Design a protein around this ligand. Structure first.
Ligand SMILES: O=C(N[C@@H](CO)C(=O)O)c1cccc(O)c1O
Ligand SMILES: O=C(N[C@@H](CO)C(=O)O)c1cccc(O)c1O
Ligand SMILES: [Fe+3]
Length: 287
């Protein structure tokens, strides 16, 4: 399940949860489909190694890669474009696991998935494995260290009594997420208590309504509005403007927090800088 690597010696033999690859050291033509690992290449000064990115889903904080060749979107993967580039490495996360075999035909394909049950250790493993390919472990370890310090700063101001609910909105549907989920970092790493520790659910969450939100009466509601990533004009603010949500402590104290979906939904948690931004976003909403 974690990435492991043996040096031998112009290359690494690399094993991860999807399979095995010989990856050359210092690859010079890397197609990156995980946006977080893309941010990490920037933080490690490896921008020139990147030859393909998913320009259809390129967020505001990664616009320094806007000039790179497109390999489509995180879901709409453009295989002909990837093949045309003749990359020496393709890096993917969970969203492209269904395309593994076709990708691995083109070139070695490294899986940098984030484990929702073990976010930090998978994050470190992902970043260090990538850094190892380039002999950059020292630099990566220093930046991981900074992230851990940001985590400690954020934890330090968390109000132990208060509780949060995490929701996703899509069209007019609300779904809920708790510990060990795709947004679990809020509870599992930053220490914010859940209104319901037992939601323990999947990729697009547990169906709920406003009645459920009032019943839980969260002090904080963290909202990931998926409509923004695609078709509005529906917006979480609209969905949540009703008398049930309005009675809630979160609504009353203006602690309905609209998290930037270009980080939370697109899931750039592998990024040495984007993960920091996400941590500060949570810290600043609760401090
Ligand atoms: O198309 C997507 N998901 C399908 C399942 O909800 C859908 O039909 O919208 C989709 C698009 C961009 C990003 C995603 O994570 C995603 O799941
Ligand atoms: O593969 C995913 N979802 C599929 C729904 O079955 C999809 O491709 O839409 C998927 C995986 C991680 C994160 C996602 O947002 C996501 O949509
Ligand atoms: Fe999705």
């Amino acid at each position: 399940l974690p990435i492991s690597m043996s040096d031998e010696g112009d290359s690494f033999l690399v094993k991860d949860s999807l399979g095995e690859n010989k990856i050359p050291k210092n690859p010079s033509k890397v197609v990156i489909l995980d946006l977080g690992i893309l941010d990490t290449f920037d933080a490690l000064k490896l921008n020139d190694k990147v030859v393909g990115v998913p320009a259809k889903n390129l967020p505001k904080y990664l616009q320094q890669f806007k000039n790179k060749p497109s390999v489509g979107g995180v879901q709409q993967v453009d295989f002909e474009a990837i093949n045309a580039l003749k990359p020496d490495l393709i890096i993917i996360s969970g969203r492209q696991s269904k395309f593994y075999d076709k990708l691995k035909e083109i070139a070695p394909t490294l899986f940098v998935g984030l484990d929702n049950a073990n976010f930090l250790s998978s994050f470190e493993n992902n970043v260090l494995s990538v850094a190892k390919l380039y002999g950059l472990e020292k630099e990566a370890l220093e930046k991981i260290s900074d992230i851990k310090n940001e985590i400690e700063k954020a934890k330090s101001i968390v109000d132990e009594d208060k509780k949060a609910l995490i929701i996703l909105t899509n069209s007019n549907k609300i779904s809920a997420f708790g510990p060990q989920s795709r947004f679990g970092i809020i509870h599992d790493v930053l220490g914010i208590n859940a209104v319901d520790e037992n939601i323990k659910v999947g990729t697009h969450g547990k169906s709920i309504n406003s009645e459920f939100i009032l019943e839980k009466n969260p002090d904080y509601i963290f909202v990931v509005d998926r409509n923004v990533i695609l078709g509005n004009k529906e917006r979480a603010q609209g969905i949540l403007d009703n008398a049930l949500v309005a009675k809630t402590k979160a609504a009353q104290n203006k602690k309905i927090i609209y998290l930037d979906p270009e980080y939370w939904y697109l899931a750039s948690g592998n990024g040495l800088e984007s993960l920091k931004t996400m941590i500060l976003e949570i810290k600043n909403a609760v401090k």
